[PDB]
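Structural prep section.
Before we set up the soaks we want a predicted structure of the protein with proline in place, mainly to decide which crystallisation condition to try first. Input record follows.
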Amino acid sequence: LEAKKEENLADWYSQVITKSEMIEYHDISGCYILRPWAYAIWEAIKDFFDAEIKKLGVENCYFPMFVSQSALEKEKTHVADFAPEVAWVTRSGKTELAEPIAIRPTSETVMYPAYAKWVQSHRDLPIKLNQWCNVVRWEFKHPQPFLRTREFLWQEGHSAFATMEEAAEEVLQILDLYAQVYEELLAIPVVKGRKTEKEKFAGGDYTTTIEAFISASGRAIQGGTSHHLGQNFSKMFEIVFEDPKIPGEKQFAYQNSWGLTTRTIGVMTMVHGDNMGLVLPPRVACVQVVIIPCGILSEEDKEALIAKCNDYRRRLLSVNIRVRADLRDNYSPGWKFNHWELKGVPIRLEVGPRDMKSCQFVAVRRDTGEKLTVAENEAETKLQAILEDIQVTLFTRASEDLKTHMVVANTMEDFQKILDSGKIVQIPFCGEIDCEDWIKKTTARMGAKSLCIPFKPLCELQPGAKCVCNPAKYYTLFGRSY
Amino acid sequence: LEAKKEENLADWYSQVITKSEMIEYHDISGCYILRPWAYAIWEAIKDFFDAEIKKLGVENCYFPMFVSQSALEKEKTHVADFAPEVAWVTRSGKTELAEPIAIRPTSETVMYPAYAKWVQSHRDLPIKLNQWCNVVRWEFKHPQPFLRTREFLWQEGHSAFATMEEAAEEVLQILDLYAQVYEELLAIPVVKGRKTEKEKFAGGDYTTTIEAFISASGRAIQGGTSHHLGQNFSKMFEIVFEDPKIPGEKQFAYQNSWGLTTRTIGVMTMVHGDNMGLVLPPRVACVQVVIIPCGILSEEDKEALIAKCNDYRRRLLSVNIRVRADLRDNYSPGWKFNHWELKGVPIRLEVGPRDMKSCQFVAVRRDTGEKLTVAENEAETKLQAILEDIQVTLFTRASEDLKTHMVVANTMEDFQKILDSGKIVQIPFCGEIDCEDWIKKTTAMGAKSLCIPFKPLCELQPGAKCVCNPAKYYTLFGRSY
Ligand SMILES: O=C(NC1Cc2ccccc2C1)c1nccnc1NC(=O)C1CCCCC1
Ligand SMILES: O=C(NC1Cc2ccccc2C1)c1nccnc1NC(=O)C1CCCCC1
Ligand code: PRO
Ligand code: PRO
Ligand SMILES: [Zn+2]
Ligand SMILES: [Zn+2]
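Run finished without errors. Recording the tokens verbatim:
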């Protein structure tokens, strides 16, 4: 790895993702191969998220990837927003299909006619379904692996309710889980918030979101979303039920949908990645500790060196640490050091003959570079500590970054200045589509746009305060965006 | 449930898949919704299969759904066989794409240019990759949920090796795991075989397979496949390495591919289903035991009855049995019986006021129907024991069916007779492409070759003739899905 993060980011990213063996390029643009090293991160995100939504009563399922023209261009607004970026299938082999079929950009239009069939009374609710699948949004903006791709893996949850109370409860429950994924697993702090009128999910009542900041970009990125759809969809798809306690009055279901994707891995790369390459937080790292023999003159002494590598491995397995021992003899110690640094392994455990004699090993923390000489009988205690402290450090540094590039401005002039150093700004705002488009026009002379309206904003808004422009309604976090 | 398995099978199947809440229909022909109850079975297969391939050094990954037209055509025998069931994306919104992009029917031509890029020497071998994903084969043939669909979920494993010895070892390892899924997980007997020339995977050298028999229709079905691709693909995609032994000579990689699908769930339905609905082999059942409070009266006794089911629950969880206590006051005991029988749960645990006070319960086995009054002391014993007997029973039952519907026919005339009683026959067969086409024409609806069984029923005697050409091998032939 030659390229440096501080100067050229695009070249750095492309080198980091390929040399870590996370990503290979495909001949179709906007499409990327997720290799084992990347896919394992997603698998850890899944193991956690799945277990958590199961407690909330959600069940896993699989719906078809194809939507009919009828199901789609039946209902407006939602379909109106996605329409341009929907990939259409128009032939099998040489045979033109009589009716074009669409690839899923999201599964509302696929799921809800099935929900309408399954809802026939109050006791068929709630319906709480999730799926792990691929989705396609065939946009032409500059793609980047993980962050911005045409095909991507996600989960999508869709729940339908008798009462608004249960639905509103679920939206926030889910949004906290998405925040838990970013802060606990990936050591990325997030701003919980609400989307503006312009940015909200097309058909829905409201949209909650977690935002994260990428230092080197000077840009922010939506990292997860939880919608309340209200009854907008239940009315369009006739998901209705009678309740004999409200005679005759048809009750349209209350709905949420929620989504999280492999963008999660890209954000991780952007935040914690350095000039040595990938940096894995221990909690998602599929290899937490890599054991490497050094000094490798007798056959018996090399055998014993290998054995001490295996002892360290088994001990680490016993305190629930994910450990590989690179005992391959085709490559030098120095080659392996660089190989596993690039891949982002939290801890490299060096074992040489002189250190065996001394009853020590070297633990090399990937975040700090910290060469630490550790006593042999403390491996478990100290590795754990370093591991959990690597997590805490990565979170601390990224938090410190966040409350450094997230600041408050009250006027258009002071918004403009702060913004062009690579920062994100909470400004007083009136929430108008017109007022938001104008901001984008002016702020570009790479235009800036809104991110979220935070649940815990930095300041309270003054009684009678004018929007950075009609009076304001809330502080709205704005910025340059992915 | 309205239809009877033996009078109208399709209607029966349609009723069992929907009434058990396994399948919903979609508005596109050939595409089906896998609801929770079906998808849980796939997840049990996945848990089993993933752990097994990880021991073999295989890793999970995700390659794109889309193939460029150049990549897809690179291996010519492969492309031609698949080209007419390939779905092509030609636009996004109104915005036409510069170049029509194809949806994967299998990932060979997606993955292998990446494999060429990754192999720079023999130290980069082996590559062993697997993915769980959906694929699309847009066939106009008559569709059937699980068994025969346009889009389905599967795993596809793709490995590349330096030597042919390494690759042939894996082909059979994977097939043995496929056999374990059917036999150990689904309590379905299978026959391990090799495909014929007409039926082998188009790009490859040889295809190993598993066949399962479905009594009710008299038809066999391909359960999964494991192909040795040889060097046919590595030559086309340039997956090459050198050896410092003979400097300057390129060796092409030896390749395998292997797939298994959600067809598994349909085969299980077809084999073990009855006129009371689905029957679940406990080994893949997400709910092994359902506890239903019966005979529902004073609230203290009514709640002590609820209290008894929860003890039965907790004591069952404790010996790692998958249990549900259906303690909803919304639905009558009778409704609960029917609903969990339709979903095919292995044991119904009936707790009624009278039997609770007499320190017992009823356990109702789903497979045979029988009801056992069982003392409360022997719960975790008799219930673990019962789950284990149901697993064997279903296997034995389907095994005895196979041992009775697979037989030997040594002439073409008596091949016809045995075949028309809804049987599958092992014949002496020459192996040739047209003699295989001829077996289909004359038997119509036609009967096709399923596999050449690793271990046929009998020994092909000194210079035996075929059904046509002398007999090269005994071959399992039948009416087919
Ligand atoms: O949006 C994405 N791509 C579109 C934007 C873009 C840019 C350039 C070329 C193509 C495209 C398509 C995307 N790509 C990868 C991972 N994740 C994504 N979205 C999310 O994470 C969102 C948050 C959660 C719910 C779903 C959206
Ligand atoms: O073959 C299948 N579909 C095609 C045939 C057909 C029939 C009617 C309408 C559409 C189509 C498309 C299919 N469908 C569902 C599940 N599994 C399948 N194949 C397998 O299990 C085989 C064994 C494993 C490897 C892949 C093939
Ligand atoms: O596309 C979206 O954003 C919503 C959330 C997941 C499912 N659909
Ligand atoms: O389609 C097939 O039969 C092979 C096996 C899985 C990948 N390709
Ligand atoms: Zn304004
Ligand atoms: Zn013949």
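Observations: The radius of gyration of chain A is 26 Å.
Flagged for discussion at group meeting.
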